[PDB]
Structures are given as C-alpha cells and as structure tokens.
C-alpha cells in the first residue's frame, strides 16, 4: 500500500484558495486532498466537486486509525480514498451521493508551448 506523500491526489500544504482554482469548472467527482487549514480538528481536508461547488470533508487520524467519523476503521488515508472511488459517500450525508472519480494529480503536468 502506497504512502500518502506519494499519492497523486495528495497536495500537502496548499491553501483553500489554491484548491478553489484547481477545482474551477471541473466535473462532479473531481477531488484532491490537502492538509487541514488548522490543526485541532482533523489532519486532512478532502475537497470534492459536486453540483458546481466544492465540498470540504475533514479526515481524522486517532489511535492509529483514519476516517470521516467515529468509529475510525481505515488503516491509511490512501485506503480510505481508494474505498470511495467505487462506493458513494451518501451513507455519511444525503448531499454526497457521489464517488471519488477524478483525482487532481500533482504528476499530471501540461506544457504551454513557446514559439
């Protein structure tokens, strides 16, 4: 199982403002994970695109476990994300009948052409 830091969709310490720009005009199910703005209520923030808006979701790490809410039963952020690529988030919140479909990859680099 791969580490969080090498995961294409993990962008570490970028701002909420930078994520806005990355998710501008993207399709539903587009997502990426970054570090939480602050420190005392969740380690990471998953941001996904739904209905032309951005939905921010705290990821908690306690006692060697990860998840969106108690009980935390995932072994890593990678395992949690991978689980919801194929499974809807609806079981947590009615507004999130959507899967994690399209990662914003830090490896996917487009080249502007110079003549």
């Amino acid at each position: 199982n791969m580490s969080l830091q090498n995961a294409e969709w993990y962008w570490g310490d970028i701002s909420r403002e930078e994520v806005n720009e990355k998710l501008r005009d993207t399709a539903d199910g587009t997502f990426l994970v970054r570090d939480a703005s602050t420190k005392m209520h969740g380690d990471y923030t998953l941001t996904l695109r739904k209905g032309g808006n951005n939905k921010l979701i705290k990821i908690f790490h306690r006692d060697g476990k990860y998840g969106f809410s108690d009980p935390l039963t995932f072994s890593s952020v990678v395992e949690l994300i991978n689980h919801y690529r194929n499974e809807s988030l609806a079981q947590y919140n009615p507004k999130l009948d959507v899967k994690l479909l399209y990662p914003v990859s830090k490896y996917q680099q487009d080249q502007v052409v110079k003549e």
């Binding site: 909420r16 806005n20 808006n53 951005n54 921010l56 979701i57 705290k58 969106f68």
Partner: peptide, 8 residues
C-alpha cells in the same frame, strides 16, 4: 462556493 460537510 466551499462548504464544510457534516459527516456524522
């Protein structure tokens, strides 16, 4: 807009 989701 950005919206923080209640997951509980």
């Amino acid at each position: 807009t950005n919206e923080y989701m209640d997951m509980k």
